[PDB]
Amino acid sequence: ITGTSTVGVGRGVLGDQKNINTTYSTYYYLQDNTRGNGIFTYDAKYRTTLPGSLWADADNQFFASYDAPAVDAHYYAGVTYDYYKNVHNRLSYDGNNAAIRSSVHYSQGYNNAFWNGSQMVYGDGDGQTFIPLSGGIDVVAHELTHAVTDYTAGLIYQNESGAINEAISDIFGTLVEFYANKNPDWEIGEDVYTPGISGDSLRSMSDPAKYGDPDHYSKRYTGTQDNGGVHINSGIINKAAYLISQGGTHYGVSVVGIGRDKLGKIFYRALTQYLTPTSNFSQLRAAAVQSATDLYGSTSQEVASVKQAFDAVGVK
Ligand SMILES: [Ca+2]
Ligand SMILES: [Ca+2]
Ligand SMILES: [Ca+2]
Ligand SMILES: [Ca+2]
Ligand SMILES: [Zn+2]
């Protein structure tokens, strides 16, 4: 809506205090006018009609328990916006400062979050398996990144292309987490998963097999569940991504790590310039190798490390 830009303050899902950009027009709305064509956060009010109502607040103070998921969806959308702009020179998910809209309090006890083709959706979790999923910055950036992929490579959400789609989202989800530099790791969802259990997460990039996900192609899932295993076989690519950045020996293959930033540049370039809707794992290897060549030279350590990594996960 039309109004004046101001700055609110509140607490997120983890009890942390943060400022948020809002818009005043009788009420203070969760509308951030400082990023592109705006960031907009809505209340689905425990129902599943979307997007719901633009979040309105009377005093610009968001310290109510009900406010927390909105605070974080709004804030971490902004962090994710900042990451794509400052690091990859990318203006929102479509590259042309599309408005980023989020809805929270989706359904009742909804243990998930997603991008629905046009916006972000966040459940509150049932309080046992999950707390409000917008509490996880990797979760927020994971889903926003599906918006980026859909507008770029267009990787079809199934089988290998689908598993690449998922890995890409786990990759930048993680890089945005490190970018915010708050308890960063190579795990996914740990901030909001199983509040009653420490140390766990939905997935691990550094060791997929800790949750039963493959870390080698020869261990790939070929059934038809989970759209052919997109959240399973993603472990093979996540593992490769982890290796390129952090290095290691995996099934006897040594990888020289090149760090997060170079991982980020190679996979972004791959994502936006070489991958296509039907790309398979072998094709991703080729795209990554070419991105690193483009970026660092065919004789670079970088290109070599990319090859090592895909080698280690059995992807030729
Ligand atoms: Ca208030
Ligand atoms: Ca973390
Ligand atoms: Ca994480
Ligand atoms: Ca937990
Ligand atoms: Zn996903």
Swiss-Prot record:
Zn(2+) binds at H142, H146, E166. The active site is at E143, H231. GO terms for cellular component: extracellular region. It catalyses: Preferential cleavage: Xaa-|-Leu > Xaa-|-Phe. It comes from the Bacteria. Keywords: Calcium, Hydrolase, Metal-binding, Metalloprotease, Protease, Secreted, Signal, Zinc, Zymogen. It is found in: Secreted. Extracellular zinc metalloprotease. This is Thermolysin. It comes from Bacillus thermoproteolyticus. The chain holds residues 233 to 548 of 548 of the full protein.
